[PDB]
Amino acid sequence: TIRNSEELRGKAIEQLEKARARLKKVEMDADQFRVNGYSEIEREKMNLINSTYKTLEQFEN
Amino acid sequence: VSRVGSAAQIKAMKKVAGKLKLELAQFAELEAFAQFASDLDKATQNQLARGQRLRELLKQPQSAPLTVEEQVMTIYTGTNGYLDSLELDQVRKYLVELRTYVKTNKPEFQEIISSTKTFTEEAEALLKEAIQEQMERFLL
Amino acid sequence: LQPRIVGEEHYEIAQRVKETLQRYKELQDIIAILGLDELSEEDRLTVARARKIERFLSQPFFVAEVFTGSPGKYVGLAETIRGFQLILSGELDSLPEQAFYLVGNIDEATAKAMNLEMESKL
């Protein structure tokens, strides 16, 4: 009986802590992903405007 | 029919589209008696689920012609089962992202297929990394 | 009726209406055999929505005012499109079927529905 509860508690805490550590890491991945996405969106917006200005100029031609 | 069928194609196309030509041949017959057998084992079903996705690749919007590399890349993605997970209404929106991803992030793939004109091992690997990268991005 | 010609929003609704209408036509033989209760919960709905859509398609005409007496309604292309969204999105599921019949605008059906409820209550 003693060897069981301890193992459960050992294993259990290794696992809660591990799960929350993973949460942190993701909190990290997402955090990273959000920054990348934001930059990509800005560039894409830039894409649209730039190319449409090119299209304008061609229309003027 | 094309009488001059494959002396016409480029080397990347002949390799890539060799798979494709067969899968549609399977899928003409697996769509036959699909409702007759009607409890589809995964030997028939996954080849039938592969088939519907294969048909989606053939779909295109009017007056938006694809470059040879895109076609080679698109055919390849579909044949391998990469798009099997995706919803049928998700396939056409995915591939458009994957092509745009590849022009933007990985322009080495276009340089291989336009110069060597052969579906090189370097080229094949180079696509996969975009597919893994692109697939991960699409999910979120 | 192509999306590049009529716009994406108009095309989706038109396609959906045909599908909903098409399913109802297929289901008519089935409904007689199994009845409306025996159908599944999706097909209690696409039968009901199809009935409302059928009624919504019918409209009072300016020319027929002499013959029927009810005033006709010229209905815009936007008021048509907005109307079949509210039927197919299910936000008007509670209304009776004869509130959609011979009305012009989507608002008229709701207005007609409310008046019917008041009359029924009376």
Partner: protein
């Protein structure tokens, strides 16, 4: 002796609980990390879309 027996049994039961406690804590850590990673990705995607739409 009775106290000694109790002490040893409690020490063992407590060890099991703590081991059970640790396992749950690690599961929570993993879940939180997974949720956080998702936020990053999804968040950025949304941002670009909204930003991409505005640029367009």
């Amino acid at each position: 002796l009775g106290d000694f027996m109790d002490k040893r049994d409690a020490s063992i039961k407590e060890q099991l609980s703590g081991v059970k406690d640790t396992s749950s804590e690690v599961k929570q850590l993993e879940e939180q990390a997974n949720a956080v990673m998702r936020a990053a990705r999804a968040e950025i995607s949304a941002a670009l879309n909204k930003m991409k739409k505005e640029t367009q």
